[PDB]
Design a protein around this ligand. Structure first.
Ligand SMILES: Nc1ncnc2c1ncn2[C@@H]1O[C@H](COP(=O)(O)OP(=O)(O)NP(=O)(O)O)[C@@H](O)[C@H]1O
Ligand SMILES: Nc1ncnc2c1ncn2[C@@H]1O[C@H](COP(=O)(O)OP(=O)(O)NP(=O)(O)O)[C@@H](O)[C@H]1O
Ligand SMILES: [Zn+2]
Ligand SMILES: [Zn+2]
Lengths: 433, 433
């Protein structure tokens, strides 16, 4: 006993957003069971080689993956992808990031006709830019219900509007030189994000290089955190978005998003009215300081950075462990004269190779996730605040919550794509110098 | 949109029966959507090596199976076992047996709590003998709804009670000598069923050898069909059962079922009252003639026999093709001096080996299935009859329907068990001569 979302329930859900794997819809009906929740629904994807097995079947886990993730029997026994992703979050990620900032959600049964109805709705409600993107996978029979982290609470409080900020921080550290070739040494001093911006700029996938440096955001320095926030505001690309009661008021158009112009900046400043009690023109600066204080105060990025640091070898190192795992002769090692560093990796007992690659894929989850920080203004006539920021410049107090979203299990075969991409980025960056 | 069976729906379903893979419950509620339907629910089984992969995970299909069944992409893409079994019936079996006698059923969503509730119900309602048998697999989220083939129509007609007969016919032919060793030649002249009865009798799994000979039932001769029916009645074991409005009135206690005694025979004769219009003591003979006429008249066994004959090589031959398929050195061939017959099999192109093994597993489906024949007496004031039998001795007309049940996909790894079992049966039978 609980429930199934049917064709008749589709009308209660409205498009919120999407990424490469999922569609997200917000609840818009009346039931107290669902107010302030979102539903996450998996897209259909062929064209993705990493999720296929040797027979071209999209299996929950490949035999190689089952072997890699063997430590959690629960995980490898997942009968479908919805269960797999839920158990990965619950059993692998939550022990690392804690339950306070991670919602694994609740699985709900869905009918085929509910999903076909949603397919049609997202086609109508999508931005034009996304109309040909992959739609819902109507062969799945579960979906995931999660709290809406664009909201602090299910309903509006009298204090003000709920403003929520979403950050895709990317990788906050630089690899050591230990498994990196002499020709690729800039990797130890220039961030992956910065190097990638150069390639995106050459491929005209962005109108200009972002001002954002993840090394600032993860620096441990309040000034540098503020710098990162100001930068994200200026050039949001797909790294920064802001919601007013679950509605986009900054960013959200993919990495193609325009850099904040006077017009965009002006509308945003007015969108903050009431939320920040400051005169016209001054709220933006207060808002950026608030986000900065919440980010720094929460310490949430320190813990994420430690999981990102589970990438101990860099992909240039870990790819060798990958080949050992899948029991193939290593083509990296054929490319030229192998480092002693690399040979020692192949010398590793198979248990250590397994552990290294697993930890690399967990780190990839941490490098690719997002954080949603939701804020609720307090009335001066409320009692004392959980976590909060006090803005002296407006003498306002804001409760806040931080949640990690988009914490997905990365397919083992993606190690190959990760290697190729890294190779291309460093090759490109090197010749641009 | 359709529905989910929830905890509250459990009360509408009552235990009907079970075999090694499934629990079956009949609908007992009021909804016209379900009256005259049964629900088939998969049991949980560990202890079954054939359904595990190389990692001990119970996958929908192994990589080897995906390769074997590659011809139906639909089949190999099944996301779970309920879909797999439904698509196997629809896409593989129905083209061979026809849609008239095969109901693939309809998948229904089920909640975990519905299944946990059913678990508890079947524990209460099971015969004591079956209380420790595997119960429902509560990790599945679908079940199968099928028409109740113990019933001719959803409700009772005024003509009489519905009497339904269920036959597990077993294999109706003898292999050729082509891939059988000289030491095992009795296989070409004595049925697998007869030989197996000897082993069961030694292992005291039956109180006595059955009188039933499948070669009679599949003979094409009306007299021999009648002989088989009379034999099944005498010693039902697990091959013969009879239902009165969905309630057991003969057989049903496993292969351990007692041979029909005077007491059992007397109760059965009274259970037929009204159904067969014949004086006390004479209905049983009329009933057996009726079943015989329906079986022979329908021709249904001719078509089943042709699918059983898809076992072209015998397991003694096909096991060699199995080893080629899974890309292993053949241990059969190591056992002693291989036949030329066997060597030629290993010489086969891989496409022919694949086809042979597939056809063997389809034949295994046909050898292990059951047929349910349901009867409805016609009133003398009804119009002319679909398929029917006229009993002159009572001047009664009976409409009948025949359905194949228990048409399951056999796991590839079971080839190993099939070989071992065959080896044991022929070894035992040989030394008993
Ligand atoms: N719990 C949530 N509450 C509110 N909004 C959410 C939530 N989860 C996701 N979203 C929004 O929906 C968008 C897409 O969700 P996301 O989980 O990133 O999709 P995805 O396809 O699984 N990720 P990716 O594969 O990295 O492109 C996010 O960018 C958020 O704006
Ligand atoms: N459609 C149906 N209508 C009425 N009764 C049925 C139906 N299907 C199954 N049954 C009854 O339920 C019993 C068990 O079903 P069955 O499909 O044989 O279970 P199973 O576990 O999948 N077979 P097996 O693995 O060969 O032991 C049968 O012997 C029938 O008496
Ligand atoms: Zn290598
Ligand atoms: Zn052989």
């Amino acid at each position: 006993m609980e429930m199934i979302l049917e064709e008749k329930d589709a009308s209660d859900w409205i498009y919120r957003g999407e990424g490469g794997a999922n569609l997200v819809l917000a609840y818009a009906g009346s039931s107290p069971l669902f107010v302030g929740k979102v539903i996450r629904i998996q897209k259909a994807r062929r064209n993705d080689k990493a999720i296929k097995n040797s027979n071209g079947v999209v299996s929950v886990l490949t035999s190689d993956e089952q072997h890699l993730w063997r430590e959690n029997n629960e995980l490898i026994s997942s009968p479908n992808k919805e269960v797999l992703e839920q158990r990965y979050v619950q059993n692998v990620i939550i022990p690392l990031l804690g339950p306070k900032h991670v919602d694994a959600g609740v699985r709900v049964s869905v009918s085929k006709e509910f999903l076909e109805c949603v397919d049609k709705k997202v086609t109508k409600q999508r931005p034009l830019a996304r109309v040909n993107a992959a739609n819902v996978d109507t062969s799945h029979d579960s979906a995931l219900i999660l709290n809406d982290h664009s909201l602090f609470s299910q309903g509006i409080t009298s204090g003000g509007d709920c403003i929520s900020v979403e950050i895709k921080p990317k990788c906050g550290f630089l690899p050591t030189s230990r498994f990196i070739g002499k020709e690729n040494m800039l990797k130890t001093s220039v961030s992956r994000f910065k190097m990638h911006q150069l390639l995106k700029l050459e491929y005209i996938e962005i109108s200009e290089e972002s001002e954002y440096d993840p090394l600032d955001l993860f620096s441990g320095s309040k000034e540098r955190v503020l710098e990162a926030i100001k930068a994200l505001y200026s050039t949001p690309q797909n790294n920064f978005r802001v919601f007013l009661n679950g509605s986009l008021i900054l960013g959200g158009s993919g990495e193609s998003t325009g850099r904040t112009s006077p017009e965009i900046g002006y509308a945003f400043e007015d969108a903050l009215k009431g939320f920040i009690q400051s005169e016209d023109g001054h709220r933006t600066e207060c808002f950026l300081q608030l986000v900065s204080d919440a980010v720094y105060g929460s310490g949430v990025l320190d813990r994420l950075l430690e999981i990102q640091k589970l990438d101990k070898l860099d992909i240039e190192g870990a790819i060798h462990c990958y080949y050992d795992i899948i029991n193939q002769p290593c083509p990296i090692c054929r490319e030229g004269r192998p480092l002693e560093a690399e040979l020692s990796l192949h010398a590793l007992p198979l248990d250590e190779s397994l552990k290294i690659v697993k930890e690399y894929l967990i780190a990839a989850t941490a490098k690719d996730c997002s954080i949603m920080i939701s804020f609720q203004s307090r009335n001066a006539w409320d009692s004392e605040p959980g976590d909060y920021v006090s803005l002296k410049p407006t003498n306002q107090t804001f409760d806040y919550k931080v949640h990690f979203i988009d914490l997905s299990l990365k397919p083992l075969k993606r190690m190959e794509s990760y290697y190729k991409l890294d190779k291309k980025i460093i090759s490109f960056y090197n010749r641009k110098q």
